[PDB]
Amino acid sequence: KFYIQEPPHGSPNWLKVGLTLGTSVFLWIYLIKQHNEDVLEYKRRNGL
Amino acid sequence: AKTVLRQYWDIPEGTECHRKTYATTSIGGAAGLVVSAYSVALKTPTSFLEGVARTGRYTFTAAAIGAIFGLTSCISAQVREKPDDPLNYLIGGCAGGLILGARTRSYGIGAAACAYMGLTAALVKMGQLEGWQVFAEPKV
Amino acid sequence: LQYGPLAYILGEKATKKMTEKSKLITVDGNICSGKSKLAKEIAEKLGLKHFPEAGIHYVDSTTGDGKPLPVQFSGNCSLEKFYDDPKSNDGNSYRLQAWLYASRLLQYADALEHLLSTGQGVVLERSIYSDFVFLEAMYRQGFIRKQCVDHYNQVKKVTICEYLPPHVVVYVDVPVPEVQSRIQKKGNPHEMKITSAYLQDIENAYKGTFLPEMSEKCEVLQYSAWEAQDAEKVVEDIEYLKYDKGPWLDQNDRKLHKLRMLVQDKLEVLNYTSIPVFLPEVTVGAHQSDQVFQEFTELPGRKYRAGYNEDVGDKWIWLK
Amino acid sequence: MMLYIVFILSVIFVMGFVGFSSKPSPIYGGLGLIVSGGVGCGIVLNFGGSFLGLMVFLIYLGGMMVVFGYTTAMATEQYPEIWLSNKAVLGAFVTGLLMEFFMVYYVLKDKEVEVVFEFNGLGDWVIYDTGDSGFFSEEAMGIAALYSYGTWLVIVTGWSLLIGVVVIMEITRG
Amino acid sequence: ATFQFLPDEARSLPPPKLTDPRLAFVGFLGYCSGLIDNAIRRRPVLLAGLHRQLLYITSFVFVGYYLLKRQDYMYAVRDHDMFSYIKSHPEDFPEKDKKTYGEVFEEFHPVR
Amino acid sequence: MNPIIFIIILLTIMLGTIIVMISSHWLLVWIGFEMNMLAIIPIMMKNHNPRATEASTKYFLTQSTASMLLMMAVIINLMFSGQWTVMKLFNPMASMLMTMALAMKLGMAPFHFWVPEVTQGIPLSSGLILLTWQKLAPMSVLYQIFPSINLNLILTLSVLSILIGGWGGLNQTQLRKIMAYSSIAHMGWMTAVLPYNPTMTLLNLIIYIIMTSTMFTMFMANSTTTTLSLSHTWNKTPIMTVLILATLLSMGGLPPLSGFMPKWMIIQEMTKNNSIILPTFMAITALLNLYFYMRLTYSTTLTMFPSTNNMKMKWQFPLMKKMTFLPTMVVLSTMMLPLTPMLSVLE
Amino acid sequence: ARQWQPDVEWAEQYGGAVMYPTKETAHWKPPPWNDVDPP
Amino acid sequence: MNLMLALLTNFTLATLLVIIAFWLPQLNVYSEKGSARLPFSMKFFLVAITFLLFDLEIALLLPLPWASQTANLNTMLTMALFLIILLAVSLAYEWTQKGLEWTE
Amino acid sequence: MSMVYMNIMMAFTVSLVGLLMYRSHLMSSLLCLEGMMLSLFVMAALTILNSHFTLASMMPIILLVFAACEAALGLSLLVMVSNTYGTDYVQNLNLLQC
Ligand SMILES: CCCCCCCCCCCCCCCCCC(=O)OC[C@H](COP(=O)(O)OCCN)OC(=O)CCCCCCCCCCCCCCCCC
Ligand SMILES: CCCCCCCCCCCCO[C@@H]1O[C@H](CO)[C@@H](O[C@H]2O[C@H](CO)[C@@H](O)[C@H](O)[C@H]2O)[C@H](O)[C@H]1O
Ligand SMILES: CCCCCCCCCCCCO[C@@H]1O[C@H](CO)[C@@H](O[C@H]2O[C@H](CO)[C@@H](O)[C@H](O)[C@H]2O)[C@H](O)[C@H]1O
Ligand SMILES: Nc1nc2c(ncn2[C@@H]2O[C@H](COP(=O)(O)OP(=O)(O)OP(=O)(O)O)[C@@H](O)[C@H]2O)c(=O)[nH]1
Ligand SMILES: N=C(N)NC(=N)NCCc1ccc(I)c(Cl)c1
Ligand SMILES: [Mg+2]
């Protein structure tokens, strides 16, 4: 215990950390799914 | 401003000097009146007569510049026999600058005004010759 | 949930935690009036939180590890130098006074933040309302310049206007001859150099200006030195107060929320204590302030925001 | 003639405007607006707008102008200054009446006038509709349609009035 | 369409690659925002809150991808409209008769 | 102000703007402006002092006058076309009245006098709204009625605004007045290009808002409202001084920063229309803005001004203000030029 | 010599009501630090 | 024409009664025997302003007897209640914010 | 146009000039602002009634309602100005000169 008053950010906000990482994972999965769906629709529409 | 500018730019350069000098005096006077109106509105004169005096001093000053530019620029074009010459306007613009150096009595202002009003007048003549648009109509 | 509008919306309203025991008490007096001892007894008996008088190192006590910092990080303000050489050309006299008013302003904010957050009252020894008595004494004795006084009033004008005055003002009135005798008995070599004229100036300002002003808006209790010995009677006097004055009657949850948002943000508290008024006594050149600030960031646990200092044991910095 | 009633009312309408627009004591300026409001209602009445005419009386004169007079008596003027006592007010008042009289005289002499823009002076009746035989008021049908057609208008209007209450309580708390 | 970010006809175009250089730059901008967030709050700039720094990159990339999709679609529409108009009005866009430099006369300006 | 009430009042400021942007009826556009003006006044008044009351009154008189002129334009348009659709107006006198009304709402010269005074008299957060969100609704109407605006009128307003904004800012030490004159100058670029390519008007508006929000947010972070107070930032938050420097240079239109992009694109569109004198005059006159932006960089970042002793007490406390979105906005404010072709999304 | 940095005399150039003093704005004063004028 | 005549008669008679009430024989032959804040509560301002806002709401409710003749009764009834409820919310806001109090 | 329109537009112009040419009282200027509203209401009502634009018959009411709410806000600012200075004179509102 160094600080005389416990700092507001002494310990991680695990709920915020979990939401933050979970949000990042979701956006990446969504982005890759969207890109994949876009590529196929493009190939289908152009006959490739 | 449209019609006055139309009278001036209809008269051939270097000719009908009295009509050119009238057109610029009216243009100069109108600019003086506009300046007086804002000056009186935003910087309230101490009295009714001070405000009237300021209106006359500014308007006469602006009409004086307009008259000298029109006469000198038309006299130059007539004498030199060069109607479509920006130099004539450069001469008239500096004459106006000298007048503004006289009404304000400041050799420095006169010298600066003559160069800048002289250059500006020459560019106006070039623009008329070559069709430069200040407020260009939209086209693309 | 650090306090804010969201916490306020969800039910953290000051009137819920406050009672008729939620009071702000300030003990005042001349030097060596036993006001420190009285302040502790009132707090103990009334179950309040006691604040020792805010000195040169009060802010250090509230930040970092709480231990005092070297002098250069308080600008080199010395109370001892004030007594030895009150007219020093370095401007220590007013620089100390300007620093101490800022220290009191910070303490008043801590005390108000404690009262509004927990509901427990507090006891202070002097406050930003009585800090000026020392300024008046300094000026009348020719220790500070007229310009310093003007600067002090400018800073006080835009700071004190934000805060509510104390509920109860307690004054322990000790005469200057008795004050002067207790000083020589206390045996602090620098303090004994204090002169009765300076002490009389403090008394005059207290009685001439402070007490009449606080009487309009606070509850003022005055005790002689003998009467202050009877702390139980002092506490008894406080508990029988009507409280029918001042702005504390006008406060409601909306206003106290605005007040709590101010006092919790300490930089917002101290904003005007550094107004750009270039008084030689408190002005610091760029080279010096740059050099001192760089040293300050090298002190243990000071380079980063609290909780982000690996050099003092903070962990999980990469998830914070 | 009563064939020019709308034109005559509009002449008085303008005179009332030159009255308060010259800005005498706010008490008398308020009177000029009240007279103009009543004359303005009469103009709307003669075009077939009975409800709209009575709203001016009910809301504009009995509502807003009452609160204007109320506020004037409180926070502006408690005793009027003599009307037209100030030269600036008199000059402005006379100038507006002189302009108005010239318009009226010229439009009546030629049954038309060009004051900036060209107007007809044959009388306003000439433009009226010539075929009405319905069993209802059309103005009433239109206003009643606020509740069937104007759902969006009701929502934003009702919201603004509520916010007006909240806002004015914030402004005045000080 | 009408008030549509990406109309259905935009789906006939190749999507931006996930390795698009412009998308890499957008991700880099998000990374810079993460560092500035640490700096203005006096945290260790490179190490603090990697979870927060990861979301800064992801958010920028996610929005940047859709912005790049709309950008390419709008330029495809500009070209589509232009070529269709050139076809609709062949009278205004005739094929110029081209002459070789042996036939075209150019004045010569000596530098002496 | 009760926090829930503050939120509802803020939501009503936004709703008034949104009604203007989605409306197809002139009456609903007028309502949006009236609703917006009703909700903005309380946030100008919220600190209860004579300066705030004077600012709110001057704002009320200006905006209520402009809204009456707008209603007059709408009614003339109704008489000469028998319809209310938001689009080109069918009467030149209606077009002038609506253009003048929108100029007054935007604070364009010569209707500019209220902007420096109102901005000075209200808190920073309120000034941020006034100079950013409040430009959206009047610009969104100009975006739609431009086919019928008088070219000489709109370009005269643009030229006067750039001149008055540039000259007016040269004489200011108050940060809120500097931003006000900067806003007047930037409104001039937005409207100058409107007759030629409204998309560039949107691009300049968006980039203007991002950069202006960044400046106000950095001023709020340190509670600075004067030049000298800002000059103490180097001794408290050195990182902030660098962010201010970058943002000011960007606002000055210097490449390779973001703020160069709107000037670059506007010059391009004007030249395509054979407008050469006006863009050149505009670009040179904007150097006046660059001058009083540079002055601020000198006293904030590139030199170290004198400090005070009490500043040391501030060293022991961290910044607690929200600074919402500041890291994102400062990056956009400075590092967007390589993505310039992205402007086509605004088509 | 160490790098020159602004002194008090340099700083006060920017602490006035206007940057360019004139006869007209001689009576102008800087506004209150907290924007509040006394009643 | 009738309404004009009735109005003209009513106020002309009122005028005649007032002037004669002022100028009647007196039978005597001897000599006969400003724009500031009035000290008035802000509460009275708020009453008048509150009346105005409620009066504007009433103007919108006045068409209700005609609106009830519509075939779009579902919409009409929903909007009537919405407007009156919003009027009630306005009153509830003034009430709970001590806007209807006369103390202090 | 019709003869009535000459005077209704004249009334609006007269009140606009009255509004732009201040004297001392803020209330006098607020009255001119209401004058412009009243002339707008009449001009709109005449146009709408004569043309038999049935659904537009509600528009003058909406104009009246919203502008009265505007006037209520204007009056509230006037009393706050009067509380500060003891009068509603515009010359007192010149602090932001500097
Ligand atoms: C990518 C394509 C687009 C290209 C466009 C150009 C991009 C560049 C613009 C990016 C936006 C600016 C971001 C700059 C981040 C700044 C961070 C940094 O460099 O360090 C700041 C430094 C940290 O100081 P401190 O907080 O105390 O922590 C260390 C302990 N001493 O603070 C200090 O120590 C104070 C330093 C003194 C002031 C020196 C200022 C000169 C350096 C300016 C660097 C930023 C450049 C801004 C202008 C753009 C340049 C192109
Ligand atoms: C291509 C552009 C060509 C433009 C040509 C413009 C020529 C203008 C010549 C102006 C010359 C002087 O320009 C400026 O004016 C004043 C005269 O009042 C000069 O005269 C100076 O003299 C003394 C110095 O002992 C002082 O009173 C003061 O410094 C100033 O009045 C200044 O030193 C100069 O800053
Ligand atoms: C320091 C420099 C500051 C900026 C200087 C900017 C100068 C800009 C040049 C002025 C603008 C050009 O000036 C304008 O050109 C057009 C050419 O179509 C002229 O056009 C004229 O042509 C015909 C015949 O020639 C005339 O009968 C007619 O009156 C007019 O249309 C205008 O009469 C002139 O007013
Ligand atoms: N110059 C100056 N000295 C101060 C100030 N506040 C306290 N001091 C000094 O702090 C020293 C001790 O304060 P005191 O509490 O009054 O003395 P004490 O004897 O220890 O405590 P008490 O018995 O209660 O009076 C005194 O020498 C004061 O001069 C101040 O605002 N300015
Ligand atoms: N109004 C203008 N002058 N410019 C303009 N918008 N021209 C339309 C041409 C255009 C240009 C870019 C794109 I991407 C698209 Cl789709 C269309
Ligand atoms: Mg003690």
TrEMBL record, chain H:
One annotated GO biological process: mitochondrial electron transport, NADH to ubiquinone
Gene3D superfamilies per record: NADH:ubiquinone/plastoquinone oxidoreductase, chain 3 (1.20.58.1610)
Record's bilayer topology term: Multi-pass membrane protein
Keyword Transport: yes
EC number: 7.1.1.2
Catalytic reaction(s) noted: a ubiquinone + NADH + 5 H(+)(in) = a ubiquinol + NAD(+) + 4 H(+)(out)
Location in the cell: Mitochondrion inner membrane; Mitochondrion membrane
Presence of keyword NAD: yes
GO molecular function terms noted in the UniProt entry: NADH dehydrogenase (ubiquinone) activity; oxidoreductase activity
UniProt keyword annotations, A-Z: Electron transport, Membrane, Mitochondrion, Mitochondrion inner membrane, NAD, Oxidoreductase, Respiratory chain, Translocase, Transmembrane, Transmembrane helix, Transport, Ubiquinone
Record-linked Pfam families: Oxidored_q4
GO cellular component, one term: mitochondrial inner membrane
Function: Core subunit of the mitochondrial membrane respiratory chain NADH dehydrogenase (Complex I) which catalyzes electron transfer from NADH through the respiratory chain, using ubiquinone as an electron acceptor. Essential for the catalytic activity of complex I.
Listed name of the protein: NADH-ubiquinone oxidoreductase chain 3
Species this chain originates from: Bos taurus (Bovine)
